[PDB]
Amino acid sequence: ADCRSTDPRKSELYVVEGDSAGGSAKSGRDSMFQAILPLRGKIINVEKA
Amino acid sequence: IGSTGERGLHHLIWEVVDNAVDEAMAGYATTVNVVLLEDGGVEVADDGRGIPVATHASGIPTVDVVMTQLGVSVVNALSTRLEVEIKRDGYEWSQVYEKSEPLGLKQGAPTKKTGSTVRFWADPAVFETTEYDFETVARRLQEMAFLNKGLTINLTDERVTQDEVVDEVVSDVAEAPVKSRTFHYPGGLVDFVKHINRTKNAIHSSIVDFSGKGTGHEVEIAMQWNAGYSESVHTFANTINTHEGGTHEEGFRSALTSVVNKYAKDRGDDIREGLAAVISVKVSEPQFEGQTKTKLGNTEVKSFVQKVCNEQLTHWFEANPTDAKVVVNKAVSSAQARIAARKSATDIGGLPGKLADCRSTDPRKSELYVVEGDSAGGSAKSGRDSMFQAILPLRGKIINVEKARIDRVLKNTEVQAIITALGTGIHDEFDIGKLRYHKIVLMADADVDGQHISTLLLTLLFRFMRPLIENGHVFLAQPPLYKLKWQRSDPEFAYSDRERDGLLEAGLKAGKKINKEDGIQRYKGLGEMDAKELWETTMDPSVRVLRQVTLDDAAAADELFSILMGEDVDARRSFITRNAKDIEPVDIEQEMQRSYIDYAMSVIVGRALPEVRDGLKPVHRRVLYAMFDSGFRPDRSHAKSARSVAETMGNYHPHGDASIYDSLVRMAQPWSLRYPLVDGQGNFGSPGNDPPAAMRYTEARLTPLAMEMLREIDEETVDFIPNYDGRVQEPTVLPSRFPNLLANGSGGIAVGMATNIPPHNLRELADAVFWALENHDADEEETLAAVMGRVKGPDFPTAGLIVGSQGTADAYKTGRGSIRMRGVVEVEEDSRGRTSLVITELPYQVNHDNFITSIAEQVRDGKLAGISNIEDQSSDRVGLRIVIEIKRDAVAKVVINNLYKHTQLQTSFGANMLAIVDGVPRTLRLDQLIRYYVDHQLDVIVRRTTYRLRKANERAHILRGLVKALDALDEVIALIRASETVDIARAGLIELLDIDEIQAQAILDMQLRRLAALERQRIIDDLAKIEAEIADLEDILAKPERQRGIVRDELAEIVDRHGDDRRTRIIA
Amino acid sequence: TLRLDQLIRYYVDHQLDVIVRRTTYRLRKANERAHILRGLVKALDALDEVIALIRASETVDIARAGLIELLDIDEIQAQAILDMQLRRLAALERQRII
Amino acid sequence: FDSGFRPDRSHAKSARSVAETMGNYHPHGDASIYDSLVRMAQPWSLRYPLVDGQGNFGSPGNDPPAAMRYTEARLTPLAMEMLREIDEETVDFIPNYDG
Amino acid sequence: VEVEEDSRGRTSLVITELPYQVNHDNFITSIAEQVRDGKLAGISNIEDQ
């Protein structure tokens, strides 16, 4: 859910999980400089991987 | 007669009709009129010769002689009244029989015209039911006209309710600006095979027809071969369906095989594989053997039919060789396909651990019980008597064998399992000798699942295992209907509705105690019953009642199964819409019909269609009510979603939280409902691919609009019915003080039929309701004109645009129309001259995240061009912002146009005005939806006024009772103190003051705080307060036009505080 | 990870705690119910005057504070009397309270 | 216990006992709850069963129990001793999922 | 395990009890497969009575 702002200085990335606060973080945000990455699946354990 | 139930009750009709038709079969009667009467009788009129009226050999008229002997005599025997009108010998007669008593034949008017008429009323003191199945009757008469090439049969049903769908072809549209059917088939058996191969879709075009005159008989055969996978070879011996077989069948088969071998020299089950044929024999002295009274014995008929078939069959192949060629290219295909089918080390093979077989080696004393795994799997396996009972629990899904090829049938595990248990083969490999259990007891629930399974198995046994039914090895468990649960005594089990009252009264009268709300248990599932209960009530031979599945007409049963289980959706749809207001030998065609309708409707009402009155399916209704009754009103603070889900799950809808929360959420989502019924808190997803948060996290409560949906439900404004565990009462419909169906819309597909109603504006809808309220006495044609105009079209929450107004006017005037929807795109240039189209509005039901991707993948595969980027800049603060970057070479106007072309940015909404009107699925016009809602609202008001009057004359009685005690307080208090017990004090009150046991208990249960001066005056003033209300509601009842007004004003108020400005703009 | 004795003793210990926690609460409740019955029994002796008082006061709050002026008791004890249903003033039921 | 399903009183459908747990104590999917309910009802599972069931409660084989709408279940004389005087502040209490 | 017989003359071993937590139907299965695979010989038949 990318923000308007092109400049990374003023940009902001919010990493959620769609199941938790995806739908709502997407609504609440100042879309001018805020982007939402709702994690919609199972993340792996990258330790001994 | 055969049965005291429905099976035997119909046999009377056949015993009457069969005489009238075998008169037409003599060639004297042209038309037979069959009338199912409103009361309970049956009228069978005809234009035959006339029943012999004059005095017989005995001395009493021949009409009376035929009515009390061998036949039709049994009709009069089992009749409370049987009238016989005869038109013969230049005059017409009366002859009436009162409870089988031949009273007298009065000769009136001189009729030079011939015929007869029999009107008989069945005895309810003898039969369980006196209600005849129209479809059962309808089907058997249809074949009666097929067998006789020049006869008309006219069936009419009188007891048809004012509204109900009567039509054979139920119109997919409009339906607006006595069930009758006529049978006449000039083709004969030719017309019959056309009817058979209608759906089967035949290879060749030439129907084989030939007639064989006999030395004491007469045969007629019609044939056609199909693409289909089975033999539809229906046989008849004197209008009787010889389903078992007989010499005419085995003579035609000999002569048919000895004909297909002569034409194989040119260029068994094998041949027959395709064929749909009809053998119609006439035998002078026919005698039938068989386990059923069917199966023609007559050995000379074999030699006659084989001689007729030999000569006439070869002849067709000689004269029509071009079709004869495509016949053998199906027959030899059948051979090599089932040849290849044919074709392990130290194996038991006997169903590993998916069955629990009986100790008994002998099949004669052995019983197999086919149960559903989760239904009676464990309880049957344990309750049983292992010495002779086996349990095959079906742990899986059963295929709809009806149209499928024997390949997919035998693959399906649950089908494959059954065959392995019985031991007998399949079609060719089938040998009844190998039968391992001499009783097959199918046990399944009354629930929508159990009925769905019964249909599936009765389809299978009828097709792939017909001998098992005929020989009478297939049964149906008859489990208890009720469990009368006494407090001190052990429970008694009732199987009948009548039997319950029996044990209920007698038991109470004998001095027993039962709860008078939840005291009786109506079973729905076998899962309910304990192991012990299961043996004592439905498994033990010493107590049980079984139901023997008997086939009574295979040709009519072929029809029933080809409709409900077949591939013809429009025939099936129609049947459902017609039949919507719905030890012992049982008919297959009637169990199969009841089980189908019950399942068909449960899946229709439950998930497919909204009610016309309140627009909801039961789940939403049950969420809203559990919420209301739990007190999650808008005044009070939100409750965790889980709480509402739990309250619905535990009391009204006991199926997994899954669907319950899924509906709760939809009613909360402002992009889902035009007028949201739920007021949510937290993450309730997005119009993209974002789900809502867990039920444990989100919170919801009713909206003040949903409060109008519920408004005064507690005041007996709707009919309540007992919930799944008959512990509480659940409403059949919600009051709906605003028109929910049209206001919010409705979608849904289930069992062939689907609905798709759009959402509308409440303000525009109130206008049309006020018009209907006011202009209460106006024509369907005028009121439809008025509703359109007030209502200017659908008003989607997601807003957008409605392009044109034909599909809009279509769906209003018919009930089916296509509504074009478009999205609002704005254009904004950058800073570096880079233009970009920004989607601000998208049509209703288009998924946001699924849309962006569509464009992305369309651009990726070249189908979309001039697009360099897509961004979702949408938030709650800046609405929808799907930002499409367009190239500097590309023209923004054409890109906007190409998106309107390919993508979801433009999509037409297909409207379907389907709704459950009086339990009947119905396609409706805008005015009908309006007038049915006003109907509801006017009922709601009188009912509300009724309860209010009752619940006031109730209170006033008490208050008058209390006031009486306040003035007599010194006496009242000095009395109570002197009396030793409460009941002694209560008796003294009824003495002292002329009051009721209820007015006196009001005094006793009265707290001391209520005696302080202000509170006495509170009771004094309350009585005169309530007495003023009583005066009013008496008037409200008295004046119906005053109630019409209440509706208007109460609804204006709702649109004056909750109505809103039109979201989507209608354009052209 | 525990031996058999570790499990037996941790059990016994919890039962011994369950008893004291109960007895403490039972006693805590027994004195609560006692002061109430003490309140009502006191009111049963003055019953004539008690009844005379309640009806002589317009509101329940004048009657409540009047029920502490009359009988030397507390607001919880005075609310126990006011909420007393008339039925509880028949001979057998008055004897149940005493 | 809180819902009053003592062994004195008649059997309540499993769905009522399930809905209550899910309602204000454990707000998850009914399967996890009902599965626990069913275990305490099975005499081949618990040596001393805590649930007095009624209906198809599966088998020690591959037979599942019936739907929660069908089976009925209540507490056991022994499970009553497990809850013996919980109302009497014999144990510590904590606030539930919503509080 | 009890060992009944003298019916037709043929002997059989009837399992009257099984250790705690063995799935009955997965056990009958287990035996039957071993028998099909030859791994368990002598067993001519298995059934839940």
Ligand SMILES: Nc1ncnc2c1ncn2[C@@H]1O[C@H](COP(=O)(O)OP(=O)(O)NP(=O)(O)O)[C@@H](O)[C@H]1O
């Ligand atoms: N419309 C009719 N006109 C003249 N005679 C009739 C008519 N309908 C019935 N009958 C006569 O009524 C008689 C009595 O009926 P019934 O006892 O059923 O004998 P049946 O028809 O020979 N045998 P069944 O095969 O059992 O119907 C018949 O034998 C006919 O002769």
Ligand SMILES: [Mg+2]
């Ligand atoms: Mg007859």
